[PDB]
Design a protein around this ligand. Structure first.
Ligand SMILES: Cc1cc2nc3c(=O)[nH]c(=O)nc-3n(C[C@H](O)[C@H](O)[C@H](O)COP(=O)(O)OP(=O)(O)OC[C@H]3O[C@@H](n4cnc5c(N)ncnc54)[C@H](O)[C@@H]3O)c2cc1C
Ligand SMILES: Cc1cc2nc3c(=O)[nH]c(=O)nc-3n(C[C@H](O)[C@H](O)[C@H](O)COP(=O)(O)OP(=O)(O)OC[C@H]3O[C@@H](n4cnc5c(N)ncnc54)[C@H](O)[C@@H]3O)c2cc1C
Lengths: 366, 366
């Protein structure tokens, strides 16, 4: 018999969607190619709860980041998911950069982020004794979250509403059925075929390629699949700052974020590296260029202190010389396929936006 | 513009093409994402020089395997590339399988493979004392090759004719210029954009995805990109057979090949496992089902003797329930794009066919 809804991918976004579908009374099967939940791009990010500052007005990134932030802070408090509203400084390290702050704060305001504080460098140093900057914007609503815990929590909720998750179960090929619904061929060690009424393609890095593997999805609707890797490095011995530090959006060349984990340890990154294949191997040498970038706002960074961290890969749907694409949530109104939502290019701030992306997917599926 | 011919991929097929274009007088640049040559599917295969036996009549696999074999044996002998014409038995392990051998031999003959010997089980045992079968076909032209040495030889040839190879240089995005030629965005330590007159996409597992990242290549022309992994297990010590041993194609369930390397060690596999992502991790549990399959023809396979080997992934352009697609060699006559050849689905016997694939690529380019 048909399963009602199949969600492909058990990342944070796939799980938020499964959770929403199951809460709506639908039978849900989540198929994940990996051996567990949240091993993918949901385990290789900064884990920052973003405020919604610099996304373009009315973009999905802007709307879903701000809505998602509110839903997520409430969810974390309600469910006891570890998180901290520790705040962030966007720091200007030259007079030219300091001049950029006013417009950045106005963009945030227009997105519904109305708590930014514009302060001078001396004020910023009062807040953060180790910090060297010309001026800053304080973003008090920016936080951090344990994304693994968040994933498990979404999973728990969905299961409580009858969802079933099946691991090491890769979707290989599918077809839109003439009569409606989908027929799906799964691979791995135990290949099998299942059919369903609703299909959610939340496959992340692989969503566009996977859509191309489903007969009946228009090929002109599917974006190209690019990969933009990011590497993080860690700092042993407890952090020099109590808030996240971000250079200005338009900072020239490499902008190194200083972020914090829940245990209080600082990490640096991610950088940007366009690559041809899905390769998570950490190149420790990529830290070399971090030093001068970080020392612009934290000159006390010691030599050799940037220890190997980890990598992630962003799902890109536009190329290295194009302006960044918005999130793509493609439902029947754009591709013409009843019962299908493809999600493409859910890079940052996808974790922050996750519960809002779930809302929007259901809205579009309708 | 910058560059006459650019070849994407330094696997055995990309190198054969680069060698042919350079020999034809073209300035050639080969761009490879990895650090050296042949680190892709060209490093994870059986290394068998196939005879041309079972491929569909008039297919590219049939024609290029047979032509390729003759060119390859000549090349190896002329240049000193290590190889062995060891021969192969196709073995029937039941009365029903034995009844299939005549039609297999007829197919081979139609493909231009005229040297198969149809013999009984006793005769087969005289050749291979450890074999248990009802009947067999001997394929004396089947062999094995040192594929790394082969690729180094191809590279040397191309370089002798002016070719340049650049590594850690992934092609990220590109576009077809309306006036002809291509503009290509490369990553790596120093990202750069280059233009060229001729573009050969020999990107293997990623060829279809890469084609989709080149604006101007008709999207309907580009097949889906599937991945079909295969696992191998090795046998420590003395090999039981002096020829390769293949069960008949229509063998029920898993057919396990027994092949030999140039050092005389036996290995078993590969199996078939359709997967979602490029993961080469060997799962030792996959050997469990090999035992019964191998024992159909080598019942003396000892308990526990299947040691972890390695895996490879086949580039597929048709799905698990479709007939195996032919090699894809997609020039201007098919997609309309001047100076472009895309190679897709170059799985086995692509190593054997490599020099013939290069011939066909140049023919189709022109
Ligand atoms: C370096 C980096 C830093 C980031 N930092 C932040 C941040 O600080 N704050 C923030 O809000 N966001 C951040 N993000 C974004 C956030 O990490 C992602 O938006 C989020 O994890 C995406 O989750 P997802 O479910 O869409 O994708 P994924 O976690 O990638 O899940 C997709 C799943 O699909 C599975 N899959 C793929 N193909 C198949 C198939 N054929 N069959 C079955 N399963 C399949 C995969 O195994 C995977 O588990 C960052 C992203 C990156 C890359
Ligand atoms: C398990 C297995 C066993 C096999 N056994 C046999 C056999 O016994 N006999 C036989 O004849 N054939 C066999 N084959 C087939 C043979 O291995 C292949 O046909 C051959 O290796 C393919 O070579 P290639 O150059 O097309 O691909 P590859 O070797 O995969 O080369 C593609 C190259 O492109 C590069 N690349 C990808 N994307 C980019 C990018 N965007 N930019 C720059 N570079 C990029 C990759 O890094 C890679 O090096 C086997 C195949 C498999 C999977």
């Amino acid at each position: 018999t048909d399963i009602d809804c199949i969600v492909i991918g058990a990342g944070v976004v796939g799980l938020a969607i499964a959770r929403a579908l199951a809460a709506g009374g639908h039978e849900v099967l989540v198929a994940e190619a990996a051996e567990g939940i949240g091993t993918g791009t949901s385990s290789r990010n900064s884990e920052v709860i973003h405020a919604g500052i610099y996304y373009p007005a009315d973009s999905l990134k802007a709307r879903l980041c701000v809505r998602g932030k509110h839903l997520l802070y409430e969810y974390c408090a309600a469910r006891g998911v570890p998180h901290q509203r520790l705040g962030k400084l966007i720091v200007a390290t030259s007079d030219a950069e300091a001049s950029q702050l006013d417009s950045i704060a106005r963009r945030a305001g227009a997105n519904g982020v109305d708590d930014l504080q514009h302060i001078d460098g001396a004020a910023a140093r009062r807040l953060e004794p180790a910090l060297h900057c010309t001026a800053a914007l304080v973003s008090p609503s920016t936080g951090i979250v344990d994304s693994h815990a968040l994933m498990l929590a979404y999973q728990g909720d969905a299961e409580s509403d009858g969802a079933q998750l099946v691991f090491h179960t890769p979707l290989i090929a599918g077809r839109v059925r003439p009569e409606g619904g989908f027929e799906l061929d799964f691979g791995g060690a135990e290949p099998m075929t299942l059919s369903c009424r609703v299909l959610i393609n939340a496959a992340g890095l692989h969503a566009p390629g996977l859509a191309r593997r489903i007969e009946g999805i228009p090929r002109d609707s599917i974006p190209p699949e690019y990969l933009c890797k990011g590497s993080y490095f860690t700092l042993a011995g407890r952090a020099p700052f109590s808030r996240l530090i971000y250079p200005v959006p338009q900072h020239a060349g490499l902008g190194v974020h200083l972020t914090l984990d829940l245990g209080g340890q600082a990490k640096f990154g991610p950088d940007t590296e366009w690559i041809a294949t899905e390769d998570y191997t950490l190149d420790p040498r990529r830290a070399d260029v971090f030093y001068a970038a970080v020392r612009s706002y934290w000159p006390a960074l010691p030599d050799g202190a940037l220890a190997p961290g980890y990598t992630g890969i962003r799902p890109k749907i536009s190329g290295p010389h194009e302006p960044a694409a918005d999130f793509a949530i493609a439902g029947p109104a754009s591709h013409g396929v009843a019962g299908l939502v493809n999600l493409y290019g859910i890079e940052s701030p996808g974790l922050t936006a996750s519960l809002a992306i779930a809302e929007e997917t259901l809205a579009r599926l309708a």
